[PDB]
A paper describes a structure:
To gain insight into how hSPCA1 recognizes Ca2+, we successfully obtained the structures of hSPCA1 bound to Ca2+ in three different states: CaE1, CaE1-ATP, and CaE1P-ADP. We found that the TMDs were nearly identical in all three structures. In hSPCA1, the N domain interacted with the P domain through several residues, including Gly518, Ser519, Ala520, Gly521, Ile545, Glu575, Thr576, Ala579, and Ile580, with a distance between the 480KGA motif and the 350DKT motif at ~25.0 Å. Meanwhile, the A domain interacted with the P domain through multiple residues, including Val165, Gly166, Asp167, Arg168, and Leu222 in the A domain, and Val646, Asp667, Val668, and Glu671 in the P domain, with a distance of 33.2 Å from the 350DKT motif to the 189TGE motif. As expected, there was no interaction observed between the A and N domains. No significant conformational changes were observed in the TMD and the A and P domains during the transition of CaE1 → CaE1-ATP, with the root mean square deviation (RMSD) being 0.83 Å. MD simulations of the CaE1 state showed a solvent-accessible cavity facing the cytosol formed by TM1, TM2, and TM4. This cavity provided access to the Ca2+-binding site, suggesting a possible entry pathway for Ca2+. During the Ca2+ transport cycle, hSPCA1 starts with a loosely arranged headpiece of cytosolic domains, with the N domain ready to bind ATP. Ca2+ from the cytosol can then enter the binding site through the cytosol-facing cavity.
Author numbering: 15 to 910
Write the structure that this text describes.
Amino acid sequence: ETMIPVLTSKKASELPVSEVASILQADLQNGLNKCEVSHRRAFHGWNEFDISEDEPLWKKYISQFKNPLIMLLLASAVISVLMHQFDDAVSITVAILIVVTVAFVQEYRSEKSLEELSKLVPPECHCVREGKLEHTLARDLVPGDTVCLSVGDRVPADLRLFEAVDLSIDESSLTGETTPCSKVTAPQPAATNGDLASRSNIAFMGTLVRCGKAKGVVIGTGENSEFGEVFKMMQAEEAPKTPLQKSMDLLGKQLSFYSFGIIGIIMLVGWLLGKDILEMFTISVSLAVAAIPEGLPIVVTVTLALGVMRMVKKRAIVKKLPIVETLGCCNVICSDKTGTLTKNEMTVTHIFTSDGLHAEVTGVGYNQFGEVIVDGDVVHGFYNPAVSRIVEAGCVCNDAVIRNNTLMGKPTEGALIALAMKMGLDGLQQDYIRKAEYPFSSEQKWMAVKCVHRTQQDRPEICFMKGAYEQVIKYCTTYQSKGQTLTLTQQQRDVYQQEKARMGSAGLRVLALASGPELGQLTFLGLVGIIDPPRTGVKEAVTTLIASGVSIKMITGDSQETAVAIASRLGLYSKTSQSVSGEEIDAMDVQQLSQIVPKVAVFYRASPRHKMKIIKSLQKNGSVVAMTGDGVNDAVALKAADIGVAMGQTGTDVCKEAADMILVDDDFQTIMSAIEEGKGIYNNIKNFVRFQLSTSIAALTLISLATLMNFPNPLNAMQILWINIIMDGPPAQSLGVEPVDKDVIRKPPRNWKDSILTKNLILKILVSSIIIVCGTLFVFWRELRDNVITPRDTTMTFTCFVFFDMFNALSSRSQTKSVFEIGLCSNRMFCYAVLGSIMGQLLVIYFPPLQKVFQTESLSILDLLFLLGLTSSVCIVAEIIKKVERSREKIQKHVS
Ligand SMILES: [Ca+2]
């Protein structure tokens, strides 16, 4: 039924708007209906670049026959096959299959996580359907739809522009031209077409709209696009690696080189004396496999993805991989007023009446949560006549209303309706009938209305007056004093002026109120203090950030008094803290301000140019900044600077596409969560590195001590492989995945020039390795008195090493906190992995097939109990060492 063809960009440009609309059967005003949209979905499909088919599971299963350590293991297996030892060959083959299976599961999990770490930020756009503007994903778009383009929005697909008002889009990512090209709606000549270089009529996908508003009819989605192929071939590229990943890779390479050298030296030493060449060779190969970091980058990727997704569970979205590691190193965290530290709503805080009483108003927002307190007493309704007359004049003589906690109109007035409604006087506005109105003007700086009571129309007309103090006081001749009307004198006017000055010096926006029968004979009522209030948890968050050592810098555009009052009421201001004006920032720029920027916290009457200036100065001495901002002017401030914390609620697509991580709640409380998640990721990486190093060093020391004087070794190739999978499998992932502890927020910020392997961690590694080696050697010498026991010594030493590794994993959960504080059962999956490892060890020890495979002899209850009692000699030592360390730290802090 007249299938809609896909119009290419050149063709859609060459015919006029009407012909293109007729071809696409597109309604320019009402848009497309849902049924036709679904039909075009069924025919065309998803508006998204065709995916590249991924290799099946057996491709990856075969691909793990690379890294030829397994190749020499299979060579040893087939050599044993040719040497007529079927049992050992089949055992090593079964161990090989188990190793490749576990590596396959680990690789599948890592690749699935990496692939799933691509849907955090979907494309967004606006479309018009059935005559209504709908907010829908760009993946929904089908040709023929009408999409509205605004300032800062990202173009979702190719469109044919029919209406445009001073359009300005950036094609630098598509054409390389730094100069935006103005767009028109008239059709372009066909002869003027090579590359774009002129195409001001057709909108291209992926470009960024800089200025202007327009509407267009989409001509093509997905694969069908002229530069859609260019964008597709630009995509599917390898993302850059974070410096932490490079450091981890370097550490792994160094560890692998040292392990290979040690293994070669040990093998040569063993071959120097009389031993078995094949058994020692395969044992050395298994040890080289064990002591090589193959799960370190994998677990780093999984823990980074888990932290990013945990932040996503919170009210924050993180895009870039190498941005997360810089969250914990931030020390110059910055913020701004009107949205970050203070909700973008006005709230009245202080009320001063004509009789001089001071009233404090609690609560924030245009809601009923809050109270008005006068001299320690809560005032509701008309209990206090002085405040009641003020709120009556405010509510009756007002034009703004509040619906579902949403305000339209003047924010200063809306704060006044909120204040009046807080005590239950929302319906007082409907109780009066307005007769005459005087609208607010910038010249007069005041407004008033004349009204009478709805049910008491016989009463004389009452005029309610408000505005700036200098204008209100001119029409006021009398004032109320404890229920008595007295003439306004000069002394009371001076008192009023000094009260206004005091309020202004404290950040209060001064608004006056009055009431009377007619203009010029009005009776004054009092003053109201309007101030942008801080959010719920901004004060506590700022205090916690400052206590750790993270300096907070505040930049705003209001007056000095309001900014300094906000800083003082939050904690940013201190005894020694200056403030720099925007004009001073403009006059002198880079050289002599960096010597004063570490001791400043307030920037008022600033600008995006001043934002760039302070960013450059703060980056000159060397620090990590957290500059925020939304819109178009705050794009470079998030590009050239450090982590660009942006807002996904009131922000534009520029700060959500061409910038760093974004917030969906527009609050300051979502930064400490990201910092804690990053520090927890770092702690998990440190714990995994410590455990892996400790177990590898212990195993290598045990094997070297067995080899040195031709001592009969207790672990064969299969047992070494099982220890390796224990140290680099489900238990390794369980150690690497751990919930964050609520103590890293007090830690000082991490420096960029830091190292994972600290002195304390290294000392603990050697302590644990020495304890494990000593315990295993003691068990081996205890069992080896009769000098002839082939199966039981190996079985018991292997199970003792397994128990020691499990206890070391239990102890290495935290570095500064004992396992008792976090609880025995904190990570459910860690406990599941521990139970699975215990079950596997029991199956290996008891199952006759596993007994034949691993050369295992069944133990008894008494031996198992003795081994469990002996294997605890490391966990308790680590726990008491940590307890002593934290007690000493607490004592030193207390006596400081
Ligand atoms: Ca390994």
